[PDB]
Design an enzyme around this catalytic site. Structure first.
Site, PDB file in Angstrom:
ATOM      1  N   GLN A 105     -48.331  12.596 -36.641  1.00 27.49           N
ATOM      2  CA  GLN A 105     -48.246  14.013 -37.223  1.00 27.49           C
ATOM      3  C   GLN A 105     -49.292  14.880 -36.432  1.00 27.49           C
ATOM      4  OE1 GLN A 105     -50.175  14.652 -41.319  1.00 27.49           O
ATOM      5  NE2 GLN A 105     -49.085  16.002 -41.572  1.00 27.49           N
ATOM      6  N   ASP A 108     -48.241  15.515 -32.892  1.00 27.12           N
ATOM      7  CA  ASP A 108     -47.079  16.840 -33.282  1.00 27.12           C
ATOM      8  C   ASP A 108     -47.638  17.731 -33.293  1.00 27.12           C
ATOM      9  OD1 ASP A 108     -44.021  16.931 -34.801  1.00 27.12           O
ATOM     10  OD2 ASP A 108     -45.516  18.665 -35.561  1.00 27.12           O
ATOM     11  N   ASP A 110     -50.348  18.624 -31.947  1.00 28.19           N
ATOM     12  CA  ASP A 110     -51.446  19.124 -30.057  1.00 28.19           C
ATOM     13  C   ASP A 110     -49.956  19.472 -29.990  1.00 28.19           C
ATOM     14  OD1 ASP A 110     -51.786  18.651 -27.613  1.00 28.19           O
ATOM     15  OD2 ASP A 110     -53.475  17.236 -28.117  1.00 28.19           O
ATOM     16  N   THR A 184     -50.651  25.355 -27.605  1.00 22.02           N
ATOM     17  CA  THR A 184     -50.418  24.662 -26.151  1.00 22.02           C
ATOM     18  C   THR A 184     -49.070  23.584 -26.224  1.00 22.02           C
ATOM     19  OG1 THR A 184     -51.973  23.285 -25.792  1.00 22.02           O
ATOM     20  CG2 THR A 184     -51.579  25.798 -25.368  1.00 22.02           C
ATOM     21  N   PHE A 186     -48.757  21.353 -23.431  1.00 19.92           N
ATOM     22  CA  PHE A 186     -49.849  20.485 -23.161  1.00 19.92           C
ATOM     23  C   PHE A 186     -50.555  19.952 -24.397  1.00 19.92           C
ATOM     24  CE2 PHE A 186     -48.392  21.902 -19.371  1.00 19.92           C
ATOM     25  CZ  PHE A 186     -49.218  23.690 -19.622  1.00 19.92           C
ATOM     26  N   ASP A 188     -53.303  18.685 -25.426  1.00 22.15           N
ATOM     27  CA  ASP A 188     -55.269  18.953 -24.290  1.00 22.15           C
ATOM     28  C   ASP A 188     -55.589  18.799 -26.222  1.00 22.15           C
ATOM     29  OD1 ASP A 188     -53.376  20.515 -26.305  1.00 22.15           O
ATOM     30  OD2 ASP A 188     -53.149  22.398 -24.865  1.00 22.15           O
ATOM     31  N   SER A 190     -55.056  20.247 -28.543  1.00 23.80           N
ATOM     32  CA  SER A 190     -55.773  22.104 -28.938  1.00 23.80           C
ATOM     33  C   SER A 190     -55.659  22.161 -30.401  1.00 23.80           C
ATOM     34  CB  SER A 190     -54.579  22.734 -28.190  1.00 23.80           C
ATOM     35  OG  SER A 190     -52.912  21.814 -28.989  1.00 23.80           O
ATOM     36  N   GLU A 258     -53.170  20.075 -44.453  1.00 21.99           N
ATOM     37  CA  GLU A 258     -51.515  20.093 -45.148  1.00 21.99           C
ATOM     38  C   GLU A 258     -52.099  18.935 -46.059  1.00 21.99           C
ATOM     39  OE1 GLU A 258     -47.466  17.839 -45.670  1.00 21.99           O
ATOM     40  OE2 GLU A 258     -49.248  17.194 -43.970  1.00 21.99           O
ATOM     41  N   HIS A 351     -41.068  12.370 -40.452  1.00 21.68           N
ATOM     42  CA  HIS A 351     -40.600  12.241 -42.204  1.00 21.68           C
ATOM     43  C   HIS A 351     -40.816  10.600 -43.341  1.00 21.68           C
ATOM     44  CE1 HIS A 351     -41.169  16.888 -41.693  1.00 21.68           C
ATOM     45  NE2 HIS A 351     -42.723  16.477 -41.939  1.00 21.68           N
TER      46      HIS A 351
HETATM   47  C1  HEM Z   1     -47.507  13.582 -45.222  1.00 26.07           C
HETATM   48  C2  HEM Z   1     -47.285  13.250 -44.058  1.00 26.07           C
HETATM   49  C3  HEM Z   1     -46.433  14.744 -43.700  1.00 26.07           C
HETATM   50  C4  HEM Z   1     -46.208  16.116 -45.078  1.00 26.07           C
HETATM   51  C5  HEM Z   1     -47.000  16.311 -46.285  1.00 26.07           C
HETATM   52  C6  HEM Z   1     -45.584  16.906 -43.492  1.00 26.07           C
HETATM   53  C7  HEM Z   1     -45.207  18.095 -44.662  1.00 26.07           C
HETATM   54  C8  HEM Z   1     -44.348  19.410 -42.738  1.00 26.07           C
HETATM   55  C9  HEM Z   1     -43.852  20.916 -43.756  1.00 26.07           C
HETATM   56  C10 HEM Z   1     -44.304  20.763 -44.600  1.00 26.07           C
HETATM   57  C11 HEM Z   1     -43.285  20.989 -42.483  1.00 26.07           C
HETATM   58  C12 HEM Z   1     -42.862  22.226 -41.961  1.00 26.07           C
HETATM   59  C13 HEM Z   1     -41.432  22.149 -42.099  1.00 26.07           C
HETATM   60  C14 HEM Z   1     -40.813  23.838 -42.184  1.00 26.07           C
HETATM   61  O1  HEM Z   1     -40.986  24.744 -42.959  1.00 26.07           O
HETATM   62  O2  HEM Z   1     -39.476  23.783 -40.964  1.00 26.07           O
HETATM   63  C15 HEM Z   1     -43.453  19.881 -41.233  1.00 26.07           C
HETATM   64  C16 HEM Z   1     -43.679  20.505 -40.119  1.00 26.07           C
HETATM   65  C17 HEM Z   1     -43.093  19.008 -38.966  1.00 26.07           C
HETATM   66  N1  HEM Z   1     -43.738  18.080 -39.398  1.00 26.07           N
HETATM   67 FE1  HEM Z   1     -44.331  17.321 -40.952  1.00 26.07          FE
HETATM   68  N2  HEM Z   1     -45.148  16.091 -42.511  1.00 26.07           N
HETATM   69  C18 HEM Z   1     -46.150  14.730 -42.805  1.00 26.07           C
HETATM   70  C19 HEM Z   1     -46.039  14.134 -41.852  1.00 26.07           C
HETATM   71  C20 HEM Z   1     -45.186  14.062 -40.632  1.00 26.07           C
HETATM   72  C21 HEM Z   1     -45.634  13.148 -39.852  1.00 26.07           C
HETATM   73  C22 HEM Z   1     -45.996  11.957 -39.974  1.00 26.07           C
HETATM   74  C23 HEM Z   1     -44.199  13.802 -38.302  1.00 26.07           C
HETATM   75  C24 HEM Z   1     -44.591  13.169 -37.436  1.00 26.07           C
HETATM   76  C25 HEM Z   1     -44.706  11.646 -36.358  1.00 26.07           C
HETATM   77  C26 HEM Z   1     -44.546  14.828 -38.423  1.00 26.07           C
HETATM   78  C27 HEM Z   1     -43.498  16.262 -37.577  1.00 26.07           C
HETATM   79  C28 HEM Z   1     -43.102  17.190 -38.119  1.00 26.07           C
HETATM   80  C29 HEM Z   1     -42.740  18.283 -37.168  1.00 26.07           C
HETATM   81  C30 HEM Z   1     -42.312  17.728 -35.757  1.00 26.07           C
HETATM   82  C31 HEM Z   1     -42.546  18.871 -37.446  1.00 26.07           C
HETATM   83  C32 HEM Z   1     -42.316  20.676 -36.840  1.00 26.07           C
HETATM   84  C33 HEM Z   1     -43.811  21.432 -36.580  1.00 26.07           C
HETATM   85  C34 HEM Z   1     -42.790  22.731 -36.261  1.00 26.07           C
HETATM   86  O3  HEM Z   1     -42.437  22.830 -34.303  1.00 26.07           O
HETATM   87  O4  HEM Z   1     -42.605  23.889 -36.432  1.00 26.07           O
HETATM   88  N3  HEM Z   1     -44.651  14.954 -39.660  1.00 26.07           N
HETATM   89  N4  HEM Z   1     -44.176  19.331 -41.765  1.00 26.07           N
HETATM   90  C1  LIG Z   2     -48.760  26.176 -43.716  1.00 27.13           C
HETATM   91  C2  LIG Z   2     -49.997  25.494 -43.760  1.00 27.13           C
HETATM   92  N1  LIG Z   2     -51.033  23.994 -43.784  1.00 27.13           N
HETATM   93  C3  LIG Z   2     -50.003  23.795 -43.531  1.00 27.13           C
HETATM   94  C4  LIG Z   2     -48.472  23.963 -43.959  1.00 27.13           C
HETATM   95  O1  LIG Z   2     -47.156  22.631 -43.876  1.00 27.13           O
HETATM   96  C5  LIG Z   2     -47.462  22.116 -43.238  1.00 27.13           C
HETATM   97  C6  LIG Z   2     -47.691  20.137 -43.124  1.00 27.13           C
HETATM   98  C7  LIG Z   2     -47.752  19.400 -42.000  1.00 27.13           C
HETATM   99  C8  LIG Z   2     -46.892  19.823 -40.559  1.00 27.13           C
HETATM  100  N2  LIG Z   2     -46.777  21.742 -40.657  1.00 27.13           N
HETATM  101  C9  LIG Z   2     -47.415  22.132 -42.352  1.00 27.13           C
HETATM  102  C10 LIG Z   2     -47.974  25.071 -44.244  1.00 27.13           C
HETATM  103 CA   LIG Z   3     -51.335  20.870 -26.855  1.00 26.33          CA
END
Ligand code: HEM
Ligand SMILES: c1cncc(Oc2cccnc2)c1
Ligand SMILES: [Ca+2]
Ligand SMILES: *[C@@H]1O[C@H](CO)[C@@H](O[C@@H]2O[C@H](CO)[C@@H](O)[C@H](O)[C@H]2NC(C)=O)[C@H](O)[C@H]1NC(C)=O
Ligand SMILES: *[C@@H]1O[C@H](CO)[C@@H](O[C@@H]2O[C@H](CO)[C@@H](O)[C@H](O)[C@H]2NC(C)=O)[C@H](O)[C@H]1NC(C)=O
Ligand SMILES: *[C@@H]1O[C@H](CO)[C@@H](O)[C@H](O)[C@H]1NC(C)=O
Ligand SMILES: *[C@@H]1O[C@H](CO)[C@@H](O)[C@H](O)[C@H]1NC(C)=O
Length: 595
Positions: A105, A108, A110, A184, A186, A188, A190, A258, A351
């Site tokens: 996560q 991701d 980053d 970013t 990269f 890095d 961020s 989150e 997920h």
């Molecule tokens: C308790 C664990 C986690 C929760 C509650 C959580 C929750 C979320 C939520 C809410 C979103 C935004 C969805 C949307 O509106 O499209 C998201 C996006 C994403 N999550 Fe998770 N997440 C979790 C763990 C993880 C893990 C472990 C990974 C990867 C190994 C991951 C990779 C991603 C990625 C790539 C996105 C899209 C981010 C972007 O480019 O906007 N997440 N997550």
């Molecule tokens: C807005 C503020 N904080 C957390 C939010 O949910 C996530 C959680 C994990 C990945 N992306 C978005 C959304």
């Molecule tokens: Ca970065």
């Protein structure tokens, strides 16, 4: 014949060509195209966007419009019929710590973030989507199928808002809609330092000339730092408990609070920065604040790259690792370092690795208190459980001794994420992360499953029987075909995660190809990659080769019993050793004997 290009939301570019440090925005990494990999630019399109109207409307937006001759299924129905499961028994990964899920996560965050369109300041647009479930403009609500329990308790839909896109924000009309990457591209750090100059400064401690990152002045963890609070209101971390009234943390990345283990990971990273900053002052008392901030940042970024490429990717990609990410050969300026749109969905494989509960463990790695174990949903946007209930040491032991969920074709996403997710501004722990992932695929104009299989040089199933063989699962292929009449229409997130995992890895072939290629570009196209000759001295690189996640923990908590290989499944006390037996990051090579 694709144009000079648009780029209205992004300002001017000014590069210092001798700088030894990365910029905060990512700009100037690539000398020929200084905006490549920079935050707040469009995500790359590895394949042309696929929208119902060829430009911006997502598939599923219009009833009568088919995709290849068939209606696409409702995102929540796919979630219910294919992604859900009841029984959490036997669902855990016998060989991956909970830290494995968590590190993913982190990496991701980053790399990518495509925030929702901002058309809600002093506006009922966001209120109306939720309140009346009326699809329009950036409101693309996820509706419930007929036999959904949520229809009885939550209304007609789950609100959903389209991701932001480059150039205008009120509708454009010439080229396909392209979503933004706000961080970013990269690797890095961020997520620690920020991706905008505005935020980067605010995170810093300028008050003192020691190159430190700001810390919380209201709370401490047995003397150890906490991230500062974000005092923007409304705060979801305050909402989840008005009594404790503890707000969300302020970090380089916007989603840091989150869930409690993520916040925990951000805290460890901050402490590391400051500890490096303090250690560098001692070795170089002449260095000023800026110098200390940058050199610490540089070391931390390298840490994340090494842990990620040397420890994490091999056990994610398995046998495909050498194929897509062969050993390093050096910086190549022709490589595109931008994160692709498809990658932001491929990386969502995590997920299916999140389990239903989180534990707090004491120094003997035994339950910490009467409610040591908690359901994941009570931990979304939960900061008080850290500040007012033990600090991070206990949660970090849980990360080390507990397991990640294992992907399973019959048990994909835990109901804690699929039925109980909480989202800021909305009020309930009643959302579905799976349905959202699917609505977002369409929102982003994602090509379907076969387009991607083809992109990866893999067969493209056209029938039930072909799909059965590819999934090696009769029943799942049958449900998918019944939902999506053709594999061509299967959303990439779900199709990519349905494939059995490759030998020694945790993702299937398709995903290994997509992830493999992106990470290869992330490394090969980074002028500041830690191993790129010139970035670090050779003696400094010999010191960096020793970093481990175990050491980061020892150096930044009061934990003294750690596994050597933090990502595999470890059991206390057998697989645990004392911090003394662990390699330290020796900083002597940074002593600048300039005389
Ligand atoms: C308790 C664990 C986690 C929760 C509650 C959580 C929750 C979320 C939520 C809410 C979103 C935004 C969805 C949307 O509106 O499209 C998201 C996006 C994403 N999550 Fe998770 N997440 C979790 C763990 C993880 C893990 C472990 C990974 C990867 C190994 C991951 C990779 C991603 C990625 C790539 C996105 C899209 C981010 C972007 O480019 O906007 N997440 N997550
Ligand atoms: C807005 C503020 N904080 C957390 C939010 O949910 C996530 C959680 C994990 C990945 N992306 C978005 C959304
Ligand atoms: Ca970065
Ligand atoms: C900025 O850095 C300084 C130095 O670390 C911090 O201030 C000191 O505050 C600590 C408690 O936080 C006390 O021991 C001393 O009163 C101060 N020490 C010195 C050497 O002056 C300050 O808190 C930091 N600010 C933030 C927001 O992190
Ligand atoms: C909100 O947080 C408060 C404050 O931490 C929780 O109250 C604590 O919980 C138990 C008793 O329920 C005690 O051991 C603590 O000392 C309590 N403190 C106070 C001031 O009551 C409370 O349970 C939380 N509520 C929710 C719904 O999360
Ligand atoms: C640099 O990248 C290009 C395009 O990705 C690649 O085809 C080429 O082989 C690379 N050049 C070197 C010297 O590796
Ligand atoms: C467990 O995973 C590790 C990688 O962290 C691997 O090297 C080891 O052989 C695996 N063991 C088993 C029994 O699967």
């Amino acid at each position: 014949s694709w144009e000079v290009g648009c780029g209205a939301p992004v300002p001017l570019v000014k590069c210092d060509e001798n700088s030894p440090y990365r910029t905060i925005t990512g700009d100037c990494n690539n000398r020929r195209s200084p905006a490549l990999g920079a935050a707040n630019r469009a995500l790359a399109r590895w394949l042309p966007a696929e929208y119902e109207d060829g430009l911006a409307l997502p598939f599923g937006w219009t009833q009568r419009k088919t995709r290849n001759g068939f209606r696409v299924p409702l995102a929540r129905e796919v979630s219910n019929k294919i992604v859900g499961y009841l029984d959490e028994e036997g669902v855990l990964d016998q060989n991956r710590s909970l830290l494995f899920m968590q590190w993913g996560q982190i990496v991701d965050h980053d790399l990518d973030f495509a925030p929702e369109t901002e058309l809600g300041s002093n506006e009922h647009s966001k209120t109306q989507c939720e309140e009346y479930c009326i699809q329009g403009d950036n409101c693309f609500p996820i509706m419930f199928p007929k036999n959904d329990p949520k229809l009885k308790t939550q209304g007609k839909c789950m609100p959903f808002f389209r991701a932001g896109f480059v150039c205008p924000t009120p509708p454009y009309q010439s080229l396909a809609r392209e979503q933004i990457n706000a961080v970013t591209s990269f690797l890095d750090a961020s997520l620690v330092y920020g991706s905008e100059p505005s935020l980067a400064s605010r995170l810093r401690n300028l008050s003192s000339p020691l190159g430190l990152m700001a810390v919380n002045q209201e709370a401490w963890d047995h003397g150890l730092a906490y991230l500062p609070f974000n005092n923007k209101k409304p705060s979801p971390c305050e909402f989840i408990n008005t009594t404790a009234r503890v707000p969300c943390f302020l970090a380089g990345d916007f989603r840091a609070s989150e869930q409690i283990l993520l916040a925990t990971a951000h805290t460890l990273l901050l402490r590391e920065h400051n500890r490096l900053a303090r250690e560098l002052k001692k070795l170089n008392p002449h260095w000023n604040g800026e110098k200390l901030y940058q050199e610490a940042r540089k070391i931390l970024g390298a840490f994340i790259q090494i842990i990620t490429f040397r420890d994490y990717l091999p056990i994610v990609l398995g046998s495909e690792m050498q194929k897509w990410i062969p050993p390093y050969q050096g910086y190549n300026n022709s490589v595109d370092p931008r994160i692709s749109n498809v990658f932001t969905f491929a990386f969502r494989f995590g997920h299916m690795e999140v389990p239903s509960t989180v534990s707090r463990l004491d120094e003997n790695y035994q339950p910490w208190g009467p409610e040591a174990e908690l359901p994941l949903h009570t931990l979304f946007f939960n900061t008080w459980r850290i500040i007012k209930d033990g600090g991070i040491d206990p949660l970090v032991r849980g990360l080390l001794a507990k397991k990640s969920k294992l992907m399973n074709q019959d048990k994909m996403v835990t109901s804690e994420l699929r039925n109980k997710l909480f989202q800021p501004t909305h009020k309930i722990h009643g959302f579905d992360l799976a349905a959202i992932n699917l609505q977002r695929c369409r929102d982003h104009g994602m090509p379907g499953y076969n387009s991607w299989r083809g992109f990866c040089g893999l067969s493209q199933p056209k029938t039930l029987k072909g799909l059965q063989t590819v999934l090696k699962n009769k029943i799942l292929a049958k449900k998918l075909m019944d939902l999506y009449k053709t594999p061509d229409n299967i959303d990439i997130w779900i199709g990519g995660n349905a494939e059995p995992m490759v030998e020694r890895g945790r993702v299937g072939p398709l995903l290994a190809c997509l992830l493999g290629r992106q990470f290869q570009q992330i490394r090969d196209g980074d002028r500041f990659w830690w191993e790129n000759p010139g970035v670090f001295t050779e003696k400094q690189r010999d010191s960096l080769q020793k970093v481990s996640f175990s050491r980061l923990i020892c150096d930044n908590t009061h934990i003294t019993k750690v596994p050597l290989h933090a990502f595999q499944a470890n059991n206390y006390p057998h697989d645990f050793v004392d911090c003394s037996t662990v390699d330290k990051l020796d900083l002597s090579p940074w002593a600048s004997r300039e005389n």
